[PDB]
Amino acid sequence: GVGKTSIARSIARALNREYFRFSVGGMTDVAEIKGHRRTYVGAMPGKIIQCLKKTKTENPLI
Amino acid sequence: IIKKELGLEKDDKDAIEEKFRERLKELVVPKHVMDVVDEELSKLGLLDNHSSEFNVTRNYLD
């Protein structure tokens, strides 16, 4: 509760590049980073794919 | 055509989904544990039916 995320948002605004935030807290499964091979029904891409898709840019502020 | 949502259409895991949801439906369930159960079911759909971690997930949701 010190505004670090708000600082990141303000930096993104000052850089004209989109903002996205990710939670790695206590995560142990790299799967969420790498998603899943897509072979299994229900397999999902890693959250980075979602971030890039929503931010609609290859130079976002992550 | 015979199926009409019978047999293969249950998948043997969405059946567990429906069972748990109906079991807790009569319950006035907390929203927090509601979303935790939703996450557990999402993982259930994200995991095969023939693995140990899936069995552990099923036991925890039980």
Ligand SMILES: Nc1ncnc2c1ncn2[C@@H]1O[C@H](COP(=O)(O)OP(=O)(O)O)[C@@H](O)[C@H]1O
């Ligand atoms: N120096 C500051 N100037 C402006 N807003 C601040 C400041 N410090 C904290 N905030 C407020 O904190 C909120 C976000 O806090 P957050 O970034 O979630 O905390 P933390 O960085 O610890 O996770 C924002 O709404 C922001 O307005």
